[PDB]
Design an enzyme around this catalytic site. Sequence first.
Site, PDB file in Angstrom:
ATOM      1  N   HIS A 224      46.626  61.997   7.903  1.00 55.78           N
ATOM      2  CA  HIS A 224      47.121  62.788   9.028  1.00 55.78           C
ATOM      3  C   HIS A 224      46.659  62.256  10.376  1.00 55.78           C
ATOM      4  O   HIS A 224      47.495  62.002  11.245  1.00 55.78           O
ATOM      5  CB  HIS A 224      46.775  64.276   8.820  1.00 55.78           C
ATOM      6  CG  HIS A 224      47.544  65.186   9.721  1.00 55.78           C
ATOM      7  ND1 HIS A 224      46.970  65.720  10.876  1.00 55.78           N
ATOM      8  CD2 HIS A 224      48.820  65.635   9.615  1.00 55.78           C
ATOM      9  CE1 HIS A 224      47.914  66.475  11.431  1.00 55.78           C
ATOM     10  NE2 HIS A 224      49.050  66.447  10.712  1.00 55.78           N
TER      11      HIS A 224
ATOM     12  N   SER B   9      52.705  68.612  14.628  1.00 61.53           N
ATOM     13  CA  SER B   9      51.588  67.686  14.928  1.00 61.53           C
ATOM     14  C   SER B   9      52.160  66.424  15.553  1.00 61.53           C
ATOM     15  O   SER B   9      51.646  65.975  16.567  1.00 61.53           O
ATOM     16  CB  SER B   9      50.875  67.259  13.653  1.00 61.53           C
ATOM     17  OG  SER B   9      49.904  68.224  13.302  1.00 61.53           O
TER      18      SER B   9
ATOM     19  N   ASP C 149      41.253  66.149  14.614  1.00 64.16           N
ATOM     20  CA  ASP C 149      41.985  66.132  13.356  1.00 64.16           C
ATOM     21  C   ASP C 149      41.082  65.692  12.176  1.00 64.16           C
ATOM     22  O   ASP C 149      39.894  66.001  12.156  1.00 64.16           O
ATOM     23  CB  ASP C 149      43.197  65.185  13.515  1.00 64.16           C
ATOM     24  CG  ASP C 149      44.320  65.476  12.544  1.00 64.16           C
ATOM     25  OD1 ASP C 149      45.086  66.432  12.788  1.00 64.16           O
ATOM     26  OD2 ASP C 149      44.429  64.757  11.531  1.00 64.16           O
TER      27      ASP C 149
END
Lengths: 92, 479
Positions: free
Chosen positions: B57, B217, B25
Site C-alpha cells: 500500500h 488513497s 501509511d
Amino acid sequence: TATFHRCAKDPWRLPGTYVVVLKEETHLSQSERTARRLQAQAARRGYLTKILHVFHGLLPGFLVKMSGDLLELALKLPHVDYIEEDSSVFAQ
Amino acid sequence: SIPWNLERITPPRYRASLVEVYLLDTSIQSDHREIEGRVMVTDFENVPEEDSKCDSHGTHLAGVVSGRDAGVAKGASMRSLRVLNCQGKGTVSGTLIGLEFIRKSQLVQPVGPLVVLLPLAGGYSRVLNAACQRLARAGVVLVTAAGNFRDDACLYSPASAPEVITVGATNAQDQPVTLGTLGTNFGRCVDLFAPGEDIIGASSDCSTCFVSQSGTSQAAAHVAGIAAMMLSAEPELTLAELRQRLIHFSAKDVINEAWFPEDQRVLTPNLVAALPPSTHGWQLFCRTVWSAHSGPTMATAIARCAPDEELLSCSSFSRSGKRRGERMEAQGGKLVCRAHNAFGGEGVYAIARCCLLPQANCSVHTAPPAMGTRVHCHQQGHVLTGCSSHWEVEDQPNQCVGHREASIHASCCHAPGLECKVKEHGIPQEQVTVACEEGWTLTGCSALPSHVLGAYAVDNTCVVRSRAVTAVAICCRSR
Ligand SMILES: COc1cc2c(cc1Oc1ccc(C(=O)O)cc1)[C@@](C)(CC(=O)Nc1nccs1)NCC2
C-alpha cells in the site's frame, strides 16, 4: 463538563485504551501530573494502569491502558476536556 | 504510453523540491527505482499486532505522489511514517502519535511548506479531527482519502475534519469508483474527486515492478502531488488559497451525479482534480460550503467559511420546501449563514459562498419587514455580493428585494477593483438555472420573490429548485 466518546462502528472499537484530552492551554507538566494522579487514584482502588504516551505539541493529554471502570473517576480529573476510547483506522 | 490518470489531471493548456510530503501509511520499499533517494523512512513504528505484502500500500502511494515515471510530482521529497500494520490496520492513537511526530520534527528542523498525506480512515473521531485542526492551524496542509465505504464522508475521520482536503475517487470514464459492493465515499465533506481506479504505481514485489491499485488513497495521492506542485510554484499560499485553487482548476460537471444517493447529489462537488495551466493576474476565487442538516426540530443549520475566507452570500435548501429562509449575521467579527426550518419540515441546509477577498470587510445591511422589503450598498467602492431573506411566520443595481412579510439581508463588500453584474433568468418547472459568463465568478445565488425549495450555487451556475420562478445570480470579476 468533561464528556466520553467511543467509535460509532462497534467492530472498530478498541476498549481498554483511552485518549485523555485536556483543556487547550494545559502545560506538559500538568498533563504528566494528571496522568500520575489517575494512576495513583486507580492503584488506591486496586486497578493496574499503564501510561503509554503523553501528548504535547498538537493537543495536551495522554494515552492510558486501563479498565473502563475508571472512566467516571478520569472524567473528574482536573483539566480534562474529554476522553475518547481508542479505535481502528484502515488503509483506503 | 501515458497512464490515463496522469493525462486526466493534465489541463487543456500546459507549459510542459522546496515542499516535503509526509506519508502516514504502511512500511515502504524505499529502494524501489520510482522513489529511491527521494524517500526518507523515519522507521517510526506505531502499529497494532497482526491478527512485499507489508509495503504494498505505502510503496504504491509514494510512487503515485513522487515516482520518476508514473508519479504526479516527479522527484518530490518524501518522508514516510509507519502507522498501519501488514494488513493495513492502525489505531486513532497511533495516528495521533505520527501527527504529533510531524509537528515535533518541524519544530526541531523547520523546512518549507509541508503536505501530509493521510490515506486512511476510521469512524468519526473527535480527537483525530481536533489533532488535524491543530496541525492545519500550525500551517500544515492535510490531504485525506474520503474513504472506500460508498457512504457519507462526514461519518469518517480524518475525512470529516473541516480543515483537511478530503478526496473522493473517480475512474477513466470520470465516474465514481466502485470497489465491488462498496466504493468511493461522497457528500458535503468531500472537497473534490481525483483518479482513483486502475492507477499504475510502484509494486513492492521487486524494485522495477509496477501494479495498478484503486481507492480514495490513490485519489488523495494525486491531490497531494498537485498541492506539492502548486506550493513549489507559490510557497506563500495559505490552506484557504490552496483549497480554492484546487477547486478552481478542477474539471467541472463531468461526474454523473445519478451514481450518488438522491439526497447526496446536491451536496457532493462535481469536480475532478487537475494541475493548473501555468505556474503564474488577480482573480476572484469562490466555492460553496454546505452545512450539516438542521434536524427535524425551530431547527437551524449553520454554514461558515474557513479562516482567511469571506462569506459573500447565503442561501438555504429543503427537499419538502418547508423552510423560513436564511440570514447572514456577524459572529466573532465574521459573517455566518443561518438557515431556518418551518412547521412539519424535515430540516434545512444553510449554503454559504466562500471567497478569497483580502482586506474586504464584508458587512451585512438588514431590513426587517415594513412594496416589498428593500436594502442597498450605498458606498463608493462597495459592491453587493449577496441577498438573503428570512420570515418569522409560515406560508435595481446594489439593491436586495424580498417579500413584504420577510426580513432582507445584503452582503456589502469594500472591493474597488471589483465589477459585479446581476443576471436574472425566469422560465414558465422543477429547476431553473442561470450561469455567470466565462471569466466571471458567481458570488451569490437566490430565487426572485410558484414555491421554491431553495437555491444553491454549483460552480458558477445558480440553481433554483421549485415544487413564474426566477433564478438570480450575482457575478463578479477583477476590473
Ligand atoms: C464537517 O463539515 C465539513 C467537513 C469538511 C469540509 C467541509 C465541511 O463543512 C463545514 C460546514 C460548516 C462548518 C462550520 O460552520 O464550521 C465547517 C465545515 C471540507 C469540504 C472543507 C471545508 O470546506 N472546510 C471548512 N472549514 C470551515 C468552513 S468550511 N472538506 C474537509 C471536511
